Every structure is written in structure tokens, then in C-alpha cells.
Design a protein around this nucleic acid. Structure first.
Lengths: 101, 48, 35, 141
RNA sequence: UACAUGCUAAGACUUCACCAGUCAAAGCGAAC
RNA sequence: AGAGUGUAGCUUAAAAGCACCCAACUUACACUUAGGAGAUUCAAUUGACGCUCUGA
């Protein structure tokens, strides 16, 4: 047992650097504020709540395998994949009165 | 087929590192980075 | 336990038997435009 | 003194406040899909069969500043609205508008072949000499 | 295949323990 | 003679978007790059100019 799978489910609060999922193959894709690793493990780049969505898959032009698979699609198909997002909770900062000069 | 060899820095002396090289290919010289002088310098092997 | 899809599942109307008769995506750009 | 009363919390509801301070977040993810959302403002060029569109948007998709050949004030000065000279013209007018909108840094992500396009080279060159930097500043953490 | 396969450092994963193992933001330094 | 009518090929497009052509790479196709032509039938919602169907 490799003990792979989703580590943090939907609606779960997440801190920066938390690992969301560990996968051998891209079962889930990095979405907003979710970074990937060498092991293709999805970690969180911000602090917030995890959401799982279905999004249109437009792969990178340099990815020749994904590119020609996209080409072989008819003019009826559009590829979809499951993405993982972190909706950030806290604002990135506040303005405080330091001194009255 | 391969040998674990060591290269010694020409500058920032006393700094060395290990790599692998083929048994048949010529003498191995690289351009590595050393933190002794914190710069990129050449490394030439001394012992396999 | 299966549940039926709520709305039109994507790639339903175009899902035809004869996939060799309808034209394909010749380019990456058109696939991107649509997506 | 009644004049000098300040809330210890200053609220600045300018949308572009934090971005101009290089502090606002960018969408860092999306490493497996083209294009990248890690930007603040994006230059998007839509080259259609008859016209050429140049767009400056936010991450929200809010179109901020547009330069279109489907616009009479410019269309009447081009022989053909789709060609390298039209692209240069659209880049020039877009840069002029962007300077006036307070936009000076943006990100342009073309396809590798679109980058190789001479029309896109002229577009980018015109935008650069316009005073717009086609590279966003790094976020401050 | 590569010679920054450098230095540091939040936060997490893990074969039911342990020992081992992974991933990594920011930063310094570098490519660009 | 009557009916349906009407934007370049197509549009529950509003002068737009895809269609389309040549030039370059390709054996070739395709991709891509650089160029080309395009249109709301004429008058005041209405009438008359063109097309299709049904008649002799």
C-alpha cells in the first residue's frame, strides 16, 4: 500500500505548504494556488479552503503528446479534468498607523 | 562500465565533489560552483 | 450506486458512431479558441 | 485636535493598490495547463480573419484597455486591417492607451509559433517603445 | 538527461510502530 | 397566376465570426507564416426587384 490519495477533502482549511494529494499519475491537476512537486504531489501555496472543480483542459503547446492528442479530437470534443484550488482566506496584509510624524 | 570519481577545485582549494564517468571516455573536467570563494570554477579529477 | 447527470453531459450531442466522417481538430489554436 | 483623528486601520479600496505595491497575490498554480494565471494584467492578441484585437485584462477577466481594428477612429487609416502594419498600429495605439490608464507592466504569453510570428515581434516592439514593460514585477512576500 | 543533482527555510505526507523515507512556499545565491 | 421569401457559402452575428483562395515548409495532406476578395435587392414597418414551390 503506497498510501496515496486525497489528504485534504473539499471545504477543509489548509495552511501554506500543506500537501493536498499524492498521486502516481495526474489524477488531479493543480488549480489556483496549488503547486506541484517532482512526485506530482499537490501542495498548497496559500492559506484557505480546498475546492475541487471540473475545468477545460488546454495543455501546453510544448507538451507534444497532449498537443497531438488534442489535435486528434473531433470538432465536437472538449477535454475536461479535475482541478484542485485553494481559496485564500486571510487578506495578504493591512495598513496600520505606525507613527504620527 | 562507470566509475565513481572525485574532482578537486582549482580555486577555493580544499573543495571537492564526486560524480560518475565512463571507463573509456577522456579525463573529466567540469565547471562547478564552490562556496569557498562562492563562485563558479573548474574541477579536474584526481582519484577514481 | 449511480446517479444520473443533472444537465447535459459534455460531449453528448456530438457523440456519433461515425467518428471517421466528422472533421477533426487540425490545429491546437482552434481547440484553444473553443476551449 | 479634532482634525487629527485617524483610524488605526487604513482602508484603501483601490483595486490596484496592492498590485501597484507588488504585494497582491497572483494565482501561482496551474502548472499543467496553458496559459499561466500568475500575472496581474495580461496582454491578449486576438488575430481573426478580418481584424486584429489587442486586449489588456486583469486576472478576473475584466477587460481594462482594448485596441481594435473594428473601430472607426483607427480602421479608416489602414489599407488592410489584418497584416503586420495593422499589428504594429494596434500595438502602438494600445501602448498609448495603456500609459494613460496607468498600466506600465503586463504579461504576454503567446504560443511558440505565435512568438515566432514577425507580426507579433512588431506588436511587442511597438508596445515596448510605447513605454509598456511586457514583464510583470515580482511579488513581494 | 543534467552539472546551482548549490545554500538555507515556513508548512505537510508516509507502507499501520521505529529506523528510515518523500514534497515544498518564502529567502540567499544563480539561469533566464 | 398564386404562395414562401431575401445579409459574400452558413449563421434565433449586430456591417461580425467561421467558412474560402493564392504564395512559403510539406511527396503530399495537415500545422504554421505572410498576402486576397467579399456582401443586409431598390424605394418609401410597407410596396415593387431576384430566387424556390404549387398551376396552365
Amino acid at each position: 500500500g503506497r498510501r496515496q490519495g486525497i489528504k485534504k477533502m473539499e471545504g477543509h482549511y489548509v495552511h501554506a505548504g500543506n500537501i493536498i494529494a499524492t498521486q502516481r499519475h495526474f489524477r488531479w491537476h493543480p488549480g489556483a494556488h496549488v503547486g506541484v512537486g517532482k512526485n506530482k504531489c499537490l501542495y498548497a501555496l496559500e492559506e484557505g479552503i480546498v475546492r475541487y472543480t471540473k475545468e477545460v483542459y488546454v495543455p501546453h503547446p510544448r507538451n507534444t503528446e497532449a498537443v497531438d492528442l488534442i489535435t486528434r479530437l473531433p470538432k465536437g470534443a472538449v477535454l475536461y479534468k479535475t482541478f484542485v484550488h485553494v481559496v485564500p482566506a486571510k487578506p495578504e496584509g493591512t495598513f496600520k498607523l505606525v507613527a504620527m510624524l | 562500465k562507470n566509475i565513481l570519481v572525485r574532482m578537486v577545485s582549482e580555486a577555493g582549494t580544499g573543495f571537492c565533489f564526486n560524480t560518475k564517468r565512463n571507463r573509456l571516455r577522456e579525463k573529466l573536467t567540469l565547471l562547478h560552483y564552490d562556496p569557498v570563494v562562492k563562485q563558479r570554477v573548474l574541477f579536474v579529477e584526481k582519484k577514481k | 450506486r449511480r446517479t444520473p447527470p443533472l444537465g447535459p453531459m459534455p460531449n453528448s450531442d456530438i457523440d456519433l458512431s461515425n467518428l471517421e466522417r466528422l472533421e477533426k481538430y487540425r490545429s491546437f489554436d482552434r481547440y484553444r479558441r473553443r476551449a | 485636535v479634532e482634525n487629527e483623528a485617524v483610524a488605526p486601520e487604513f482602508t484603501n479600496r483601490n483595486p490596484r493598490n496592492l498590485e501597484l505595491l507588488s504585494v497582491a497575490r497572483k494565482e501561482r498554480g496551474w502548472r499543467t495547463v496553458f496559459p499561466s494565471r500568475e500575472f496581474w494584467h495580461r496582454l491578449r492578441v486576438i488575430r481573426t480573419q478580418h481584424h486584429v484585437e489587442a486586449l489588456v485584462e486583469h486576472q478576473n477577466g475584466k477587460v481594462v484597455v482594448s485596441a481594435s481594428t473594428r473601430e472607426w477612429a483607427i480602421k479608416k487609416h489602414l489599407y488592410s486591417t489584418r497584416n503586420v502594419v495593422a499589428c504594429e498600429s494596434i500595438g502602438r495605439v494600445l501602448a498609448q492607451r495603456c500609459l494613460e490608464a496607468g498600466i506600465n507592466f503586463m504579461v504576454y504569453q503567446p504560443t511558440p509559433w505565435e512568438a515566432a510570428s514577425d507580426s507579433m515581434k512588431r506588436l511587442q516592439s511597438a508596445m515596448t517603445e510605447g513605454g509598456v514593460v511586457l514583464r510583470e514585477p515580482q511579488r513581494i512576500y
